[PDB]
Structure 1
Amino acid sequence: GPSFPEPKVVRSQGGLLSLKLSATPTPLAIAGQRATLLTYGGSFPGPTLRVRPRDTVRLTLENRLPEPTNLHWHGLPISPKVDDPFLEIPPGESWTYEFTVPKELAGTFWYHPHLHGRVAPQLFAGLLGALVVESSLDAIPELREAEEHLLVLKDLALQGGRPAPHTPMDWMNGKEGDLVLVNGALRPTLVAQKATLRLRLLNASNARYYRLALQDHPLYLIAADGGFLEEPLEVSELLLAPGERAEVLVRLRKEGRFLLQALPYDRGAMGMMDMGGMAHAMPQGPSRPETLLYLIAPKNPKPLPLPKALSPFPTLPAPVVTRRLVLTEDMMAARFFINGQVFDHRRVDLKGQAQTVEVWEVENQGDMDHPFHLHVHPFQVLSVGGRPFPYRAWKDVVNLKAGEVARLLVPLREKGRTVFHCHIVEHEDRGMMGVLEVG
């Protein structure tokens, strides 16, 4: 096959993407060993769905797992009556998700389970895939002539040829695995044929962070979770928290081999020690550095010029309300709270009005990083930790370090009941989720 493994793509045909997926335990070869994973479509990652605005998606999910499951269309501003976080598909049953892709949309999205209390083991076991909304902007020459690749960043740990079970400490920290994979492959080689790459990046890990840096190169950020930036932004490294996506251009500068690495990053995960008195929680400290892939540049590379502009960011109406959502932890209990409460699917926490704009101030009063996710309603990050964000783009996950406040501008789009939650999915399963109702 290709040097660079990527999930097989399913494209809409004549404006319709009609597909039956099964969620199933699946023997496969991964990272050179046999294992049984839980997969969509028989593969890990699941197939990449590639659509355009105004396409119809008709996805029938057949549940062949021994437990109930459902799908969250992560990042898509569609109705929560379709992207329904409360729906349960029992074992052996099927459900058809049907929606129209919004007109004003572009970027990399993804799909995964969202059945409260079961997300973390289902996602860890292999249930996830990408969705790409292709744009008329992809025809500008500076993007069309780039070599495009999707990188699904997701780690795994195997025990007995199956995903390793969750321990108590995994429920507290979020589970990370020792196999740090790209598109299900261990440290693949990307032999570039063009001097400009356009990389779609997805962090589909339960809890692992990827502090991305390409040796000897900057990255040019051109899209965040839910859409393009207004113009490319040069960065020396890019932190992708669980659930985040980004698209970057890479402008290869000379022949050679360059490592794409996940550089050491301390997200506040905790261990336990006993030193005589004790036992007490102690910080795990930074992650060990990981090589994600080997990038081989072509001979005599001469990258394209960068595009001068991408997409203008919408002018939003003035906001009508300011919310404040405070995140806290009880680590030894592995319990996690928003404004002092755990999730209750019967309780509405916030009630807002469709087509108004809200300011949400999300404050992390814990010691771990928490990546905050809001379904259905993409947002503009104004500032985090008191620092203004350096670009305007739609996001749907924002990472908060310990102590930091994020200020978000949140246009409320579709009516209905939806959720917001930490995207360290163990923390959502353990209570860090609340209910927004839009009317």
Structure 2
Amino acid sequence: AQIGPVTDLHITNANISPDGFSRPAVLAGGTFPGPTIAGNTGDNFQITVFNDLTDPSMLTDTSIHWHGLFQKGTNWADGPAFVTQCPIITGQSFDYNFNVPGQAGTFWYHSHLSTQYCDGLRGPFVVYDPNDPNASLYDVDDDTTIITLADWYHTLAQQEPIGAAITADATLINGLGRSFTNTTASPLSVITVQSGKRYRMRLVSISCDPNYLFSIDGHDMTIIEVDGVNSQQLTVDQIQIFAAQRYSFVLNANQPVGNYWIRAQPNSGGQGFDGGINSAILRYEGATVEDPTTTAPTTFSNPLVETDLHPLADLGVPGQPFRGGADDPLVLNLAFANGRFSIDGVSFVPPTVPVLLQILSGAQNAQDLLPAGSVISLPSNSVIEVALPAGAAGGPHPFHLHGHNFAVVQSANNATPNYVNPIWRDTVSIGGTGDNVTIRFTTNNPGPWFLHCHIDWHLEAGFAIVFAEDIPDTASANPVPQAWSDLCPAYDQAHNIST
């Protein structure tokens, strides 16, 4: 069952064995992935998060981010630790009370403390649209049509060396999959369809690192949504999905009744499908209960290419049709050396006082804010352009901006910008050496918004900056509840920190 929009959510430690290997984890709602949180567009969500964690090896504090939800007027509820709040301590709870005006689509929630979401705190978050303009393109859209893709590690996250190339031990599809080494024939996930029906499959990357080549043998996929943004219909036979991205696609159950492999090949870790790694099963009602016998093609003839995507609505592009054609045109210098990432010469290390609390306490320019050199102010009601030229080790890096979606003016592997009709999204691969992936948005949401690579090991190694958007209006725009004001005193008392 789905939960929400008003619900409790308990965060616990438990043993799980999603690939046959038992390890302890950090779980929401007692499962991996966590339960789907759902509501309708414009609803009030009140997710009262109970921190019941006791195992220090995965951290007993927590904080949860609602990925892709704009949090306009509720920056305090966004979740990134030491940007918008201090962590919730064990034995305490916190009501994330916010609204989702003007958004409808496929989202997710995850821990936003250290690398804790890798240890299991990740689940789907769906905002349905009762008047969806795509409603007539499918018959079925429910909890059974959500497909999560996850990396899973046998080593606990707090034992992963900072700045290292860290590699997973299994791909999990809907929480199940097989280990790349010491492979055992543990259970695979089954997605069941009825011959002749059309399904809105909501594909969610809950990855901490790898991108996946996703396909379904015998079937093609008609994309209708990208990171919450409705798209024109685009039919593909493979989707390369980067960490934290989402797609909705129409699956037409138009092939003979039978069993078909669902494939998710990561860019690192186990390659291929031996022993049923990187796999799940599409089963038609009436098919025999047995593994598929289907083959992938040697090459995919209609893969997703990001420049093929276009919004369903006439979203356009803000600013002027050339590089630098914005009120505030930025170019970030994105680098890696010696185990640490940097942005504009500064490696991100979380501050003691959350950025939002520094601003509410009166610090009002970005050079007054900590960490020094890690906060860039943005002017209000302005067109912002951010060029993100690739080349830093560990690519391709999927960059994500909190508080906003953005026009993808230039995509990976293509030097031509699009100032007319590019897709809008919230997480974008910056590509490879010599690329110049560039995003645009307008500043209509006061508050500090994190910008970072969504490979969680890279964020931990410093690949982040904070956009302090409209500092002067942050306090008036974002009134804070007493329970939020109580978080830093409680956290600092529990941890013997002076501030």
State the TM-score, normalizing by the size of structure 2: 0.71
> Distance in 1 between the 2:431 and 2:398 partners?
9
Among 408, 420, 429, the residue aligned to 1:381? 408
CA distance in 2, matches of 1:314, 1:356: 17
- Name the count of aligned residue pairs: 388
- Opposite residue 26 of structure 1, the aligned amino acid is A
Q: How far off is 1:63 after superposition?
A: 1.6
Deviation per CA, 1:11-40, whole angstroms, max 9, x where unpaired? 4xxxxx222212110234534565432101
Output the CA distance in 2 between the equivalents of 1:30 and 1:263.
17
Inter-partner Cα distance in structure 1 for 2:76 and 2:67: 14
1:360-413 CA-partner distances (Å, limit 9, x unpaired): 111112242111111111111121242457964431110122222111112223
Shift of 1:158: 2.9
**1:111 equivalent among 101, 109, 112:** 109
| Equivalences for residues 21-40 of structure 1 within 5 A | 21-28=9-16, 30-32=18-20, 34-40=22-28
80, 93, 117: which is aligned to 2:75? 80
Counterpart of 2:280 (choices 273, 282, 293) is 293
Structure 2 counterparts to residues 8-157 of structure 1, below 5 A = 8-11=1-4, 17-28=5-16, 30-32=18-20, 34-65=22-53, 66=56, 67-78=60-71, 79-85=74-80, 86=82, 87=85, 88-102=87-101, 104-115=102-113, 118=114, 120=115, 122-138=116-132, 141-146=135-140, 148=142, 149-157=145-153
Instruction: Give the Cα–Cα distance (whole angstroms) in 2 for the partners of residues 361 and 165 of structure 1.
Output: 32
- Residue 239 of structure 1 aligns with which residue? 240
Alignment correspondent of 2:327: 320
What's the counterpart of residue 292 of structure 2? none
Distance in 2 (CA, whole Å) between partners of 1:90 and 1:313 is 45
Matched-pair contact (CA < 8 Å) for 1:377–1:413: no
SS class of match (1:172): coil
Question: Structure 1 residues 31 and 383 mapped into 2: Cα distance closer, same or farther (>3 Å)?
Answer: same
> Residues 139, 361 of structure 1: CA spacing in aligned structure 2 closer, same or farther, 3 A cutoff?
closer
8 A Cα contact 1:196 1:252, kept in partner: yes
- Corresponding residue for residue 369 of structure 1: 396
Q: Tell me, yes or no, if structure 1 residue 405 matches structure 2 residue 424.
A: no
Partner Cα separation in structure 1 for residue 47 and residue 203 of structure 2: 23
Q: Does 1:180 align with 2:180?
A: no
Q: CA RMSD in A?
A: 2.7
Q: Which amino acid aligns with 1:142?
A: S
Tell me the SS of whatever aligns to 1:199. Answer: strand
The one-letter amino acid of 1:401's match is G
Whether 2:382 is the aligned partner of 1:356: answer yes
Displacement of 1:326 in angstroms is 2.4
**What runs of 5+ residues in structure 2 fail to find an aligned partner?**
178-187, 288-309, 320-325, 352-369, 471-499
CA distance in 2, matches of 1:131, 1:47: 9
In the alignment, is residue 199 of structure 1 matched against residue 201 of structure 2?
A: yes
Deviations 1:93-126 (A, max 9, x none): 2221111111x211111111112xx2x2x11211
Matched residues in 1 for 2:214 and 2:282: separation? Answer: 14
Q: Does 1:250 find its partner at 2:275?
A: no
SS at match of 1:10: coil
Normalised by the size of structure 1, how large is the TM-score?
0.81
Name the structure 1 match of 2:222: 220
Residue from 329, 335, 344 that aligns with 1:339: 344
CA gap of 1:80–1:342, structure 2 versus 1, over 3 A, is same
Judging changes above 3 Å, is the alpha-carbon distance between structure 1 residues 328 and 415 closer, same or farther for their aligned structure 2 residues? same
**C-alpha distance in structure 2 between counterparts of 1:139 and 1:109, whole Å:** 18
User: What secondary structure, in the 3-state scheme, does the structure 1 residue paired with 2:62 have?
Assistant: coil
SS in 2 for 1:239: strand
Q: Which residue identity does 1:179 align to in structure 2?
A: A
Higher helix share: 2
1:297-329 CA-to-partner distances (Å, cap 9, x unmatched) read: 4589xxxxxxxx984143454232211112211
Question: Which residues of structure 1 form unaligned runs of 5+?
Answer: 1-7, 12-16, 270-283, 301-308
Q: Which amino acid aligns with 1:248?
A: F
Aligned counterparts of 2:421 and 2:237: Cα–Cα separation in 1:
15
The question of whether the paired residues in 2 share the 8 Å contact of 1:258 and 1:295 is answered with yes
* Structure 2 equivalent of residue 260 of structure 1: 262
Shift of 1:244: 0.9
* Kept in 2: contact 1:228–1:393 (CA 8 A): no
- Note the C-alpha offset of 1:146: 3.6
Over residues 200-255 of structure 1, what are the superposed CA-to-partner deviations in whole Å (9 max), with x where a residue is unaligned? 111112112111122233221111112211x1112231111111111111223321
Deviation string, structure 1 residues 275-302 (Cα, Å, up to 9, x no partner):
xxxxxxxxx8x944554311134589xx
Following the alignment from structure 1 to structure 2, what is the Cα–Cα distance between the partners of residues 360 and 27? 43
Matched-pair contact (CA < 8 Å) for 1:172–1:335? no
d(CA) in 2 for partners of 1:253, 1:152 = 23
Which one-letter code corresponds to 1:349 in the other structure? V
Secondary structure of 1:427's counterpart equals helix
Change over 3 Å in CA distance of 1:226–1:141 after alignment to 2: closer
- The 1:238–1:391 alpha-carbon spacing in structure 2 relative to 1, beyond 3 Å, is farther
SS of the equivalent of 1:426 reads helix
Pairwise CA distance, 1:185: 2.0
